[PDB]
Amino acid sequence: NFQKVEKIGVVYKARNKTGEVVALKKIRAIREISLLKELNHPNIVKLLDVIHTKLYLVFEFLHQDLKKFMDASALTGIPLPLIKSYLFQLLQGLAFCHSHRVLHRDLKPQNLLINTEGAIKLADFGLARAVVTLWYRAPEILLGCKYYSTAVDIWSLGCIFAEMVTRRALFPGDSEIDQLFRIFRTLGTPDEVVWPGVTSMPDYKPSFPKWARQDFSKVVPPLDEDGRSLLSQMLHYDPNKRISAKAALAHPFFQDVTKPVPHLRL
Numbered sequence: 086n087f088q089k090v091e092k093i094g095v096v097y098k099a100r101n102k103t104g105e106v107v108a109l110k111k112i113r114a115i116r117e118i119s120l121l122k123e124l125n126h127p128n129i130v131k132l133l134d135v136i137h138t139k140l141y142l143v144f145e146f147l148h149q150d151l152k153k154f155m156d157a158s159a160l161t162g163i164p165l166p167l168i169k170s171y172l173f174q175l176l177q178g179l180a181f182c183h184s185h186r187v188l189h190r191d192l193k194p195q196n197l198l199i200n201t202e203g204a205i206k207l208a209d210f211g212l213a214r215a216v217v218t219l220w221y222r223a224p225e226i227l228l229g230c231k232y233y234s235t236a237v238d239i240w241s242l243g244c245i246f247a248e249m250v251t252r253r254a255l256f257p258g259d260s261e262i263d264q265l266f267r268i269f270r271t272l273g274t275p276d277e278v279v280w281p282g283v284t285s286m287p288d289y290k291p292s293f294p295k296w297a298r299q300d301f302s303k304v305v306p307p308l309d310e311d312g313r314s315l316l317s318q319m320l321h322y323d324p325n326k327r328i329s330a331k332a333a334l335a336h337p338f339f340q341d342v343t344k345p346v347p348h349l350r351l
């Protein structure tokens with residue numbers, strides 16, 4: 086049914102024998118996933134079909150992702166108005182999915198798809214359970230919290246925001262404890278003062294080193310106080326204190342938001 090075009094489980098660019106070009110995911114429940122076909126938002130990649138016969142998911146196709154765009158933009162950096170537009174749009178997408186009680190759980194630049202018209206869209210949701218990259222994982226997940234909240238996605242998006250600004254990954258760890266300790270060295274080792282209940286987390290150890298907290302002026306330097314304030318709220322340790330997607334959309338950082346068009350080399 087599909088003429089495979091290129092390898093993008095495994096994901097292929099494919100052509101429907103409708104002429105439509107799509108992203109085809111072969112996975113190698115069915116009722117629950119099918120509900121997502123009719124929940125649509127401009128900032129979420131559209132799920133066109135679900136087929137189980139091996140599980141195939143057919144998605145709308147977009148040509149580039151934010152990881153490729155950040156690498157292409159690394160000599161100059163993404164312009165601040167575009168960073169701001171992308172952050173605003175991703176928060177609109179998260180506000181929508183969270184309002185329908187759907188979490189992403191695995192946001193990273195390579196799952197954020199962009200087009201020539203200035204849009205960015207959430208893709209590659211980690212909905213199966215409902216080298217692994219840990220750089221965007223919320224600290225409650227790393228500490229073994231059994232129940233994720235919407236706050237895990239805000240953490241990941243804050244890490245992505247910092248990376249778009251500074252052109253380097255915020256917390257590039259290579260094991261769960263290295264990831265945790267990279268977070269602790271920058272934001273301070275969490276305690277009951279800033280995160281009530283942290284010492285009760287399944288994987289918390291009293292023997293964790295106690296690092297002091299750095300300053301956000303050192304963390305995302307070029308960024309102004311509106312952006313640093315929003316980032317600090319997206320990176321609160323306590324998931325209950327971390328800002329929601331809806332509240333973040335009202336932050337003063339977005340008062341001058343626009344929708345620029347990026348320069349894409351396809």
Ligand SMILES: COC(=O)c1ccc(NCCc2c[nH]c3ccccc23)c(C(=O)O)c1
Binds near residue numbers: 110142210
């Ligand atoms: C084993 O894999 C899976 O079960 C699975 C299920 C759904 C997926 N995406 C759904 C995108 C979506 C479309 N409309 C939405 C409204 C709200 C929230 C999300 C959406 C993906 C993926 O993106 O890969 C995988």
